[PDB]
Design a protein around this ligand. Structure first.
Ligand SMILES: CCCCC/C=C\C/C=C\CCCCCCCC(=O)O
Ligand SMILES: *[C@@H]1O[C@H](CO)[C@@H](O)[C@H](O)[C@H]1NC(C)=O
Ligand SMILES: *[C@@H]1O[C@H](CO)[C@@H](O)[C@H](O)[C@H]1NC(C)=O
Ligand SMILES: *[C@@H]1O[C@H](CO)[C@@H](O)[C@H](O)[C@H]1NC(C)=O
Ligand SMILES: *[C@@H]1O[C@H](CO)[C@@H](O)[C@H](O)[C@H]1NC(C)=O
Ligand SMILES: *[C@@H]1O[C@H](CO)[C@@H](O)[C@H](O)[C@H]1NC(C)=O
Ligand SMILES: *[C@@H]1O[C@H](CO)[C@@H](O)[C@H](O)[C@H]1NC(C)=O
Ligand SMILES: *[C@@H]1O[C@H](CO)[C@@H](O)[C@H](O)[C@H]1NC(C)=O
Ligand SMILES: *[C@@H]1O[C@H](CO)[C@@H](O)[C@H](O)[C@H]1NC(C)=O
Ligand SMILES: *[C@@H]1O[C@H](CO)[C@@H](O)[C@H](O)[C@H]1NC(C)=O
Ligand SMILES: *[C@@H]1O[C@H](CO)[C@@H](O)[C@H](O)[C@H]1NC(C)=O
Ligand SMILES: *[C@@H]1O[C@H](CO)[C@@H](O)[C@H](O)[C@H]1NC(C)=O
Ligand SMILES: *[C@@H]1O[C@H](CO)[C@@H](O)[C@H](O)[C@H]1NC(C)=O
Ligand SMILES: *[C@@H]1O[C@H](CO)[C@@H](O)[C@H](O)[C@H]1NC(C)=O
Ligand SMILES: *[C@@H]1O[C@H](CO)[C@@H](O)[C@H](O)[C@H]1NC(C)=O
Ligand SMILES: *[C@@H]1O[C@H](CO)[C@@H](O)[C@H](O)[C@H]1NC(C)=O
Ligand SMILES: *[C@@H]1O[C@H](CO)[C@@H](O)[C@H](O)[C@H]1NC(C)=O
Ligand SMILES: *[C@@H]1O[C@H](CO)[C@@H](O)[C@H](O)[C@H]1NC(C)=O
Lengths: 295, 656, 98, 49, 49, 49, 98, 30, 87
C-alpha cells in the first residue's frame, strides 16, 4: 500500500497537463532568455542546466536497481551494506516514472507556460506573445500595462540577471537541497538498523540459529527458536509502523506540492506569500531527486 | 512405465472436524504432477512412505509384504486378503523368491503381532507411512474405465489402519494371483493447503511448492487472485551435497587411564588433568563400565557424537553417597562450600559410580578426608590445600588447647554400611563449544571439500547450509571463526588444510509475479530483478531484458498505450490479443503550437460541463472488549489478566 | 486468535483440562501477552487510518465551504474550467460534489 | 473453528452432535452525569429488543 | 465470596473507602478507570455476562 | 512500571535478594523486554500526536 | 537408549519402575535376561531389533570362531548378594494421547 | 612514583575474527 | 612510562586454582617497572580491515565518551545531545 501511494503521489504531482507540448526552436521571447530552463538538443542529456545542477547536488545510495549474485560474491573483503541488506531479505523497488519522463513533463510545462500562458489549464491552449502575457500579469496585481510597455528592456535585463544569480547560487556547494537528502538518509538508516537489530538473542541461549541446532536436539531447541521468531517479527512490525508514519508525512508534503503546482504554474494566485515574497507573476517547475523545485 | 500423479493421493491429516475453512498444513504428501512407476514383482524400496494404486478387473493384487532384509533373519509384516477376510501378521518368516497364489512362506516362529478381520474398471488407492513405530494405512476407492494409464482426477483418502509394529521397513513387494496394473510413487515433506466443504469434506488442495502462482495462493490463503503484480518470496535453491570437515585424529581417547586408576585423591585435594588430541567414542564403555549418575549441563546428550570440544579438563575425586547430589551448580553443603564448587555457566558433564568393592576395606578405610571448617566459602574451581589449626575468633592457636580444632575430618568407609555411607568415584568433565580451536572430536567421518555450490556443511560441529568460497582474510593462530555485525558466521578455517573460507547464503534476489484474474487464465508472467538475460525457475517463453529486470512469459510490443499493470521503470503490462503483453507506457498526446509575435487566438463559443468528485468523510466506529478477546468465559484467566488493566484502558481511550 | 505464542496449545480449555493451576498460569500468561500485543497493533493501525480520514474530511469541509457557499477564483480547485456553481450530494461515508 | 475454538462435540452416551456457544454477548453503554450531581445512571443495551 | 474490590488509602495509610466492582455497572466503570469520580458522558462498559 | 510480565515479581530487588545471579538473569530479561515494549508504545503514540 | 529401547521427545504418558529382587533374582546367578551392546546404528523411537547375527566392525559377514567377530548380546548376571545397582527392576511404560 | 596510563593495555576479549566493525564490550580493563 | 596505544595478545591460560592476593617481581643482582589495577568497565573497540584493534573508547571517562558509546560512532556532528542523567 505504501509503494502504491508513492506512485500515486508522483502521478498526481507531475502529470497535471494532458498534452505534451514540444520545445520551441527559439528560446528568446521578446527580451527574455529561456535557454537555462529548457532542454537543448545538442547535449546528450534530456534535461535543463538547472536540473543538471539539482541532480548533481543530491548523492544517491544504490544508483540503480540491479545487484547480481556474482557481483555480491565478488566483493566480500569490501563489506558492502547493500549486499548485506539483500542477503537478509530487504529489497528496494524501482519507481514507475523514470527521471527522463519527469524531465519531459517539466519541459512540456515550461514550454506551455512560455508559449500559451495560463489558458492551457482551463482548456485548449491559446497562443499569445510573451509581452502581452506579461502585461496581463502586471495588470493582475494592480499596475497598469504601460508600465511594462515603457520599461521592457529593464524588466528583461532584471529577469535575465535573476536567472543568472540563481544559477550562480546553485553552482556553489550549500544546503539548499537539504530536505531531499533527509529522505534517503532515513531510508538507508532504517534498513541498516534492521540489519544491526538482528544480533539480539531476546533471552535465549544464543543469537545464532546454527549454535542452537548444533548443540541441542530438536526438542529443547524449538522453544529457544520461538523466542527469536517473536523478537524478529516484533522488529519487522516496528519498522513497518515507522514507515507508515513517514509515508503519511510524505503524502501531506506531496499534496501541498500538487496544489501549489496547480495554482501557481497553471495560473496566477492572489494568496499572500503562497508563492514567493511579493506580488506573484510566474512560476517554473524543475525536477529534483525525489522532489520538485519551484522558481 | 513412467506416468504422472496429477493431483493424486490426498488424505485427512488429523481426526478433527472442520467445515467451510481453508487449512494450511505441512506433512508427508505426494507432490502434484510427480513421477510414478507403473508395473504391468521385484523388490521396490520403501522411502518414508509410498502411494500405491491398483487398476484391476479380476482382483489380482492380494496384499503386501513389508520388511528390510526379507529373509528369515529379521521381522516382516504381511497385510493380505485371502478372499474371505483381511489378515495382518507381523512375524519372522523365510520368504520365497516367487510368492503367488497358496503358500507365501515356509515357516514362522517369532511371531509378534496378529490381527484377523471379520469374514466377508476399479481403482484402489493406498497410502502407507511409517512413523514412531506405527504403520499408517489410508484407503480410497474410485470406479474408472481407462485401460492403460493412471487416470487424472482428485480423490481423498481416509484412515483405515494404525498398526503398532515397530519394524524396520525399507523394502516391500506386492502379492499377485497366478489385465491388472499397479503404480508406485514416493512421499515427500511438503506444505499443502486444503479446502473443506460445508459437509466437512476435502474437495480441493494447493501444493505450495509447485509454481510461483501456488506460492502466491498459499501466501494470501485464497483460491482467487485479483489482477496485478505481487512480490513473492525471494529466489531459493536447495542444497545438493554434504561437506564434513574434522581434524585428522587417530588415537582412542584415554577412558581407561581416567576411569580405571588404582588411586583417586580426596575431595579436598581433587585432581585436574588435561585431555587433548583424542577421539572420544564413549561406545567402548558399554561392555565393562557403568555409571550410577551421569548428568550434563550446556549440551544435550544425543548430540555428543556430532560435535568437537575445545578445552577439555577432567577433575577426579571420591565422596560418600550422600554427597554426590552436591556436585551440581547452585548447591549448598559441606562439599559445595568448603571442598569443591561449580559455577553456573558450567559446560560439561558429571559422572559418578559406586566403588565399594575397590575403595572400601573391612575394619575401616580412613585414607579419605574432607574439610568441614573454614572462614569463608570457596570460589568456583578453587582449591584449598592447607592444614592449619582453626579458631572461631580468627587468631592462631595450639591444637591441645580450648576452642582450637583440626579442620579435616576422616571418611570412615566400611563394607557393611548402607549405601549412603559407601564410597563413590566422581569425574567432572568441563569444556567449551564452537568458539575456539578444538582437538577432541567425535567419531564422525570426514568428506571432501566442495566449492562454489550450495551445500550442507559441518565444520568442527558447526552445521549449516551455504556456499563456500576461497577467502582473502588473515586469521591469527588463536582464531577459528569470524562473524558479521549481525553475529552471522561468515568465515571459517578448514581444520585439515589451514585455508580460510567464506560462507555465503544461497537465496538472493527479488521475484514478482504479474497475473490477470484467476478467472481469466492460470498463466502468469515472472519478473526477476538482479539477473541479466541463469537464476530463473524455468525458461518458458519470450525471455528478454527490460529496465526493471528480466521478464519471462510476456510478449514485447512496439506500440504504446496507457497501462493497467505498472511493472516499473517505465514498463507496463496488459492482457491483449489472448496473451500477456509488455510495453512502454505513453505519457500523453503529442501536440504542437507555434509561437508568433503578432497573432493571438481567441475562443468564439462555449460549453457547460458538470464534473463529479467523491470524497470520504468518516469511517466505522469500533470498540473492543479485552476480557472477552483474551479470556473468554474463564475466571482463572481473568484473575491473571487483572494486573494488566492499565494497558487495556489505554486502548479503550484511543478507540473512544 | 489461533496463534499459541510459544505455549503448549492455543486453546485455554486444553491447558486448564490437562495441567493443574500451577504450571498452567505460566502458559496462560504467554497467551495474555500475545493477545494484548495483537489488540495494540490493531489500535495503532486504526489511529493512522483515522488520521488519513480526518485530513480527507478537512479538505472536504473547506471545499464545501469555498465552492458551494460561494464562487472560487482558485485554479482547478473545483472542476476543470472556470467555476460557476457546485452541488453537494450525500454518499455512504462520504460526499459527492457536482 | 477458524480460531481453534472447540464448537462441536459428540455425546459419548447417545451418539448425537452438540454445538457449544459462549454465554456472553452484546455491548453495554452507561450514560451518566457527573458523579457530583447524582449516582443515578442510564443503561443502553444494543442487541436486545 | 471471591470478589474484586478497589480500596482507597489515606495519607495516614488507612483504608477509608472501597468500591465493590460487581455491584452495578457504575461500579464496573469506576473499577475500569480506577477513579472515584466520573465525568459527564457515555462510556462503553464490559459486555453482558 | 508495576507489571511483572510473567516473572516471579515486579521488583528487581526481590529477584536479586532471593535468587542467585543465575536463575535471576532469565527473570530480569523478561522485565527488560516488557519495559522496552512500554517505552516503544509511548514513542509511537507521541509520533502520531 | 541407543540399542535397546528409545523414547521420543513428544512423549505423552507415564513411566513406572519397581525393584524385584525377591522374584527375578536367584542364588548362583540368573542368566535369562539379555541386552544388546553392539549395533551399526542407533534405534529410532519405539523401534525394536530382534535379530541375533554375528557382528563385525568392518561390516562384512563372519564366523564367530574367528578374529574381530562377536556375538551382539550380553547376559545380565542377577545375584541375591549384589548391591542395589546390580539388582533387577521391572519397568512398565504407558503411552497415550489426550 | 605516580604516573598515568594514557590509553595503555588493551587486549583481545575473545577468539573470534572481526573486521571493519565496532564492537562494544564490558570486561575487566585498565 | 611513554604515552601511546598498543594491543596485547593472549599467551597463557593456566589451570592453577590458586588463591592469588599478593605478588612480587624477581630481579637480577637502569630498569623500572610499573603496576596498575584493572576495573570492570565498558569499552568500545574498533577493528581494521585486517582484523586488528587500533582504537578504543572508554565509556566512563567523560560525557563526550558516553555520547560516543551511546551512538556507537567515533564522529559526532555539531549540536546538543541529551546524555544519561547524573549518577
Ligand atoms: C530447626 C530450625 C531450622 C530453621 C531454619 C530456618 C530457615 C531455613 C534456612 C536454612 C535451613 C537449611 C538446613 C539445611 C542444612 C544443610 C543441608 C546439607 O547438609 O547440605
Ligand atoms: C541567453 O542564455 C544563453 C545561455 O546562458 C547565453 O549563451 C546567451 O548569450 C543569452 N542571451 C543573451 C542575450 O544574453
Ligand atoms: C521424471 O521422469 C522424467 C521422464 O523420464 C524425467 O525427465 C525426470 O527427470 C524425472 N524426475 C524425477 C524427479 O525423477
Ligand atoms: C534360514 O534360511 C536358510 C536358507 O534360506 C536356512 O539354511 C536356515 O536353516 C534358516 N534358519 C531358520 C532359523 O529358519
Ligand atoms: C483366510 O484366513 C483365515 C485366518 O485363519 C482363515 O480362518 C480362513 O479360513 C481363510 N480363508 C480361506 C478361504 O482359506
Ligand atoms: C527368535 O527365534 C530364535 C530361534 O527360533 C529364538 O532362539 C529366540 O528366542 C527368538 N526370540 C525371542 C525374543 O523369543
Ligand atoms: C534399520 O533401521 C536403521 C535406522 O535408520 C537403518 O540405518 C538400517 O539400515 C535399517 N536396517 C537395514 C537392514 O536396512
Ligand atoms: C452435503 O451432503 C448432503 C447429503 O444429502 C448433500 O445433499 C449435499 O449436496 C452435500 N453438500 C455439498 C456441498 O455437496
Ligand atoms: C579395570 O580394573 C579392573 C579392576 O577391578 C580390572 O579387573 C580390569 O581388567 C581393568 N580394565 C582393563 C581394561 O584392564
Ligand atoms: C566384551 O567383554 C567380554 C568379557 O571379557 C569379552 O569377552 C568381549 O570380547 C568384549 N567385547 C569386545 C567387543 O571387546
Ligand atoms: C592431517 O592434518 C594435517 C594438519 O595440517 C595436514 O597437514 C594433513 O594434510 C592432514 N592429512 C591428510 C591426509 O589430509
Ligand atoms: C547486463 O545488463 C546490462 C543492463 O543493465 C547490459 O548493458 C549488459 O549488456 C548486460 N550484460 C551482458 C553480458 O549482456
Ligand atoms: C456555438 O454558438 C451558437 C450560438 O452562438 C450555438 O447555436 C451553437 O450551438 C454553438 N456550438 C455548439 C457546438 O454548440
Ligand atoms: C451405554 O452406552 C451405549 C453406547 O451407545 C448407549 O447405547 C446406552 O444407552 C448407554 N447406557 C445408558 C444407560 O444410557
Ligand atoms: C424488534 O425490533 C424491531 C426494530 O428493529 C421492531 O420492528 C420489532 O417489532 C421488534 N420485535 C418485536 C417482537 O416487537
Ligand atoms: C492522620 O493522623 C493525625 C494524627 O494526629 C491526624 O491529626 C490527621 O487528621 C490524620 N489524617 C487524616 C487525613 O485524617
Ligand atoms: C582465599 O580466598 C578467599 C575467597 O575470597 C578469601 O576470602 C581469603 O582471604 C583468601 N585467603 C587469604 C589467605 O587471603
Ligand atoms: C593489512 O596488512 C597488509 C599486509 O601486507 C598491509 O599492507 C596493509 O596496510 C594492512 N592494512 C592496514 C589498514 O594497515
Amino acid at each position: 500500500g505504501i509503494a502504491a501511494e508513492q506512485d500515486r503521489n508522483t502521478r498526481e504531482v507531475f502529470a497535471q497537463v494532458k498534452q505534451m507540448y514540444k520545445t520551441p526552436t527559439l528560446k528568446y521571447f521578446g527580451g527574455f532568455n529561456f535557454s537555462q530552463i529548457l532542454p537543448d538538443p545538442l547535449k546528450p542529456t534530456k534535461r535543463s542546466f538547472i536540473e543538471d545542477l539539482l541532480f548533481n547536488k543530491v548523492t544517491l545510495a544504490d544508483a540503480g536497481f540491479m545487484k547480481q549474485y556474482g557481483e555480491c560474491l565478488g566483493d566480500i573483503n569490501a563489506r558492502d551494506l547493500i549486499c548485506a541488506q539483500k542477503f537478509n531479505g530487504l529489497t528496494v523497488l524501482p519507481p514507475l516514472l523514470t527521471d527522463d519522463m519527469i524531465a519531459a513533463y517539466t519541459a512540456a510545462l515550461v514550454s506551455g507556460t512560455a508559449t500559451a500562458g495560463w489558458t492551457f489549464g482551463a482548456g485548449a491552449a491559446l497562443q499569445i506573445p510573451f509581452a502581452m502575457q506579461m502585461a496581463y500579469r502586471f495588470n493582475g496585481i494592480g499596475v497598469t500595462q504601460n508600465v511594462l510597455y515603457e520599461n521592457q528592456k529593464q524588466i528583461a535585463n532584471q529577469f535575465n540577471k535573476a536567472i543568472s544569480q540563481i544559477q550562480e547560487s546553485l553552482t556553489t556547494t550549500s544546503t539548499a537541497l537539504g530536505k531531499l537528502q533527509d529522505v534517503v538518509n532515513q531510508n538507508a538508516q532504517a534498513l541498516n538498523t534492521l540489519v544491526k537489530q538482528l544480533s539480539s538473542n531476546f533471552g535465549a541461549i544464543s543469537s545464532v540459529l546454527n549454535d542452537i541446532l548444533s548443540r541441542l536436539d530438536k526438542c529443547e531447541a524449538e522453544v529457544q527458536i520461538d523466542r527469536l521468531i517473536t523478537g524478529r517479527l516484533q522488529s519487522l512490525q516496528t519498522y513497518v509502523t515507522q514507515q507508515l508514519i513517514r509515508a503519511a508525512e510524505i503524502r501531506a508534503s506531496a499534496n501541498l506540492a500538487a496544489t501549489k503546482m496547480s495554482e501557481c504554474v497553471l495560473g496566477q494566485s492572489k494568496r499572500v506569500d503562497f508563492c514567493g515574497k511579493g506580488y506573484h507573476l510566474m512560476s517554473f517547475p524543475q525536477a529534483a531527486p525525489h522532489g520538485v523545485v519551484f522558481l | 512405465t513412467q506416468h504422472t500423479s496429477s493431483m493424486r493421493g490426498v488424505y485427512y491429516p488429523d481426526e478433527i472436524f472442520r467445515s467451510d475453512t481453508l487449512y494450511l498444513t505441512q506433512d508427508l504428501f505426494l507432490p502434484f504432477y510427480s513421477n510414478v512407476t507403473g508395473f504391468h514383482n521385484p523388490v521396490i524400496p520403501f522411502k518414508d512412505g509410498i502411494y500405491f494404486a491398483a487398476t484391476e478387473k479380476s482382483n489380482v493384487v492380494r496384499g503386501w509384504v513389508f520388511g528390510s532384509t526379507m529373509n528369515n533373519k529379521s521381522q516382516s509384516v504381511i497385510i493380505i486378503n485371502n478372499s474371505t477376510n483381511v489378515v495382518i501378521r507381523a512375524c519372522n518368516f523365510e520368504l520365497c523368491d516367487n510368492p503367488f497364489f497358496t503358500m507365501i512362506f515356509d515357516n514362522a516362529f517369532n511371531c509378534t503381532f496378529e490381527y484377523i478381520s471379520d469374514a466377508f474398471k476399479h481403482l484402489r488407492e493406498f497410502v502407507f507411512k511409517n512413523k514412531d513405530g506405527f504403520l499408517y494405512v489410508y484407503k480410497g476407492y474410485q470406479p474408472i474405465d481407462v485401460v492403460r494409464d493412471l487416470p487424472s482426477g482428485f480423490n481423498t483418502l481416509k484412515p483405515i489402519f494404525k498398526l503398532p509394529l515397530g519394524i524396520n521397513i525399507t523394502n516391500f513387494r506386492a502379492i499377485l494371483t497366478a489385465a491388472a496394473a499397479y503404480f508406485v510413487g514416493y512421499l515427500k515433506p511438503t506444505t499443502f493447503m486444503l479446502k473443506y466443504d460445508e459437509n466437512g469434506t476435502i474437495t480441493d488442495a494447493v501444493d505450495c511448492s509447485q509454481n510461483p502462482l501456488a506460492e502466491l495462493k498459499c501466501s494470501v490463503k485464497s483460491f482467487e487472485i485479483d489482477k496485478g503484480i505481487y512480490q513473492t518470496s525471494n529466489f531459493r535453491v536447495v542444497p545438493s551435497g554434504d561437506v564434513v570437515r574434522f581434524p585428522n585424529i587417530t588415537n582412542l581417547c584415554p577412558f581407561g587411564e581416567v576411569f580405571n586408576a588404582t588411586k583417586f585423591p580426596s575431595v579436598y585435594a581433587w585432581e585436574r588433568k588435561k585431555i587433548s588430541n583424542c577421539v572420544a567414542d564413549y561406545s567402548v564403555l558399554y561392555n565393562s563400565t557403568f555409571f550410577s549418575t551421569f548428568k550434563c549441563y550446556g549440551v544435550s546428550a544425543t548430540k555428543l557424537n556430532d560435535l568437537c570440544f575445545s578445552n577439555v579438563y577432567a577433575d577426579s575425586f571420591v565422596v560418600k553417597g550422600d554427597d554426590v547430589r552436591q556436585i551440581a551448580p547452585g548447591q549448598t553443603g559441606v562439599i559445595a562450600d568448603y571442598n569443591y564448587k561449580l559455577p553456573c555457566d558450567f559446560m560439561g558433564c558429571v559422572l559418578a559410580w559406586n566403588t565399594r568393592n575397590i575403595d572400601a576395606t573391612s575394619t575401616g578405610n580412613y585414607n579419605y578426608k574432607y574439610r568441614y571448617l573454614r572462614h569463608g566459602k570457596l570460589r568456583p574451581f578453587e582449591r584449598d590445600i592447607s592444614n592449619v589449626p582453626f579458631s572461631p575468633d580468627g587468631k592462631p592457636c595450639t591444637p591441645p588447647a580450648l576452642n582450637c580444632y583440626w579442620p579435616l575430618n576422616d571418611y570412615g568407609f566400611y563394607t557393611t554400611t548402607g549405601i549412603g555411607y559407601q564410597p563413590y568415584r566422581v569425574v567432572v568433565l568441563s569444556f567449551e563449544l564452537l568458539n575456539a580451536p578444538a582437538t577432541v572430536c567425535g567419531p564422525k567421518l570426514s568428506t571432501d571439500l566442495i566449492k562454489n555450490q550450495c551445500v550442507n556443511f559441518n565444520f568442527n560441529g558447526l552445521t549449516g547450509t551455504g556456499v563456500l568460497t576461497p577467502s582473502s582474510k588473515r586469521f591469527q593462530p588463536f582464531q577459528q571463526f569470524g562473524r558479521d555485525v549481525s553475529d552471522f558466521t561468515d568465515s571459517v578455517r578448514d581444520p585439515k588444510t589451514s585455508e580460510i573460507l567464506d560462507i555465503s547464503p544461497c537465496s538472493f534476489g527479488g521475484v514478482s509475479v504479474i497475473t490477470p484474474g484467476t478467472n481469466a487464465s492460470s498463466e502468469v508472467a515472472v519478473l526477476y530483478q538482479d539477473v541479466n538475460c541463469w537464476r530463473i525457475y524455468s525458461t518458458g517463453n519470450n525471455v528478454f531484458q527490460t529496465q526493471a529486470g528480466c521478464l519471462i512469459g510476456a510478449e514485447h510490443v512496439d506500440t504504446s498505450y496507457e497501462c493497467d499493470i505498472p511493472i516499473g521503470a517505465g514498463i507496463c503490462a496488459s492482457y491483449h490479443t489472448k496473451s500477456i503483453v509488455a510495453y512502454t507506457m505513453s505519457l500523453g498526446a503529442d501536440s504542437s503550437i507555434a509561437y508568433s509575435n503578432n497573432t493571438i487566438a481567441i475562443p468564439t463559443n462555449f460549453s457547460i460541463s458538470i464534473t463529479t468528485e467523491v470524497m470520504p468523510v468518516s469511517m466505522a466506529k469500533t470498540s473492543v472488549d479485552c476480557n472477552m478477546y483474551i479470556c473468554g468465559d474463564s475466571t482463572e484467566c481473568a484473575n491473571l489478566l487483572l494486573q494488566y488493566g492499565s494497558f487495556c484502558t489505554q486502548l479503550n481511550r484511543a478507540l473512544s
